[PDB]
């Protein structure tokens, strides 16, 4: 009857704080995620656009063999788009990521986004959130692994755990940035745990189709779990 989703931020926001240490209890600092520099990470998201990762992997590295970033802008874009052929519409992914690069090379700096860490975090998120094929998520990962700044990224695995367990209700995944955000302290190193124990609980636990409910730290505060028992469905849109 009293879902989590339906209570008060703040009691949203403990939710969430005790969500984040039973996670770290289950996962520590085990980290899933890529780890990449934040230009691979940028063209990699590029190139990610209902591709496969062993697709996109294979596409990045064929696109490196035309040399370096000032290269791959000068390089004529059908030569691009045969380089990122392994990836799902090459033709379209060319003109992002010569784009994205030419604007990359303009900011201070070079092939680099070392301006970032001293702008406004909105300002930040808007200037890569502005750049062709990327997206919230993407900015909120480089801005937060790459530059520590306090923005909390929000991809499949952390919108649907959060969902399922009730820390926010159902809204899309642009919308659950700002929610949970709002519901977390400005602290990048804590944002950061809570993102990879997320990831390492929706790839392992909370799955997307038939979540092991039984073996998850968390099932007795879970809005899902209470509705469902152990026929919680699958995370559609
Ligand atoms: S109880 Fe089930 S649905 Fe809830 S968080 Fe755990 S695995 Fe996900
Ligand atoms: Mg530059
Ligand atoms: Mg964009």
Redesign the pocket.
């Given at each position: 009857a009293p879902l989590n989703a339906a209570r008060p931020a703040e009691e949203r926001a403990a939710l969430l704080a005790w969500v984040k240490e039973r996670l770290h209890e289950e996962y520590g600092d085990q980290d899933p995620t890529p780890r990449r520099d934040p230009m691979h990470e940028l063209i990699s998201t590029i190139l990610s656009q209902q591709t496969t990762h062993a697709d996109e992997e294979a596409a990045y590295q064929e696109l490196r063999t035309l040399g370096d970033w000032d290269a791959i802008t000068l390089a004529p874009t059908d030569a691009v788009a045969h380089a990122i052929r392994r990836s799902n519409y090459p033709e379209s992914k060319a003109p992002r990521i010569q784009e994205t690069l030419r604007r990359?090379?303009?900011?201070?700096?070079?092939?680099?986004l070392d301006?970032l860490r001293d702008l406004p975090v909105k300002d930040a998120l808007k200037w890569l959130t502005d750049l062709p094929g990327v997206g919230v998520k993407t900015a909120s990962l480089v801005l937060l692994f790459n530059y520590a700044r306090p923005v909390f990224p929000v991809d499949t695995h952390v919108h649907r755990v959060s969902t399922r367990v009730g820390v926010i209700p159902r809204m899309g995944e642009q919308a659950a940035h700002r929610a949970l955000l709002a519901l977390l302290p400005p602290d990048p190193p804590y944002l950061y745990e809570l993102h990879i124990n997320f990831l390492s609980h929706g790839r392992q636990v909370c799955t997307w189709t038939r979540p092991k409910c039984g073996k998850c730290i968390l099932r007795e505060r879970c809005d899902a779990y209470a509705l469902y028992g152990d026929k919680v469905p699958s995370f559609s849109e």
């Open positions: 990359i090379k303009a900011a201070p700096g070079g092939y680099d301006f």
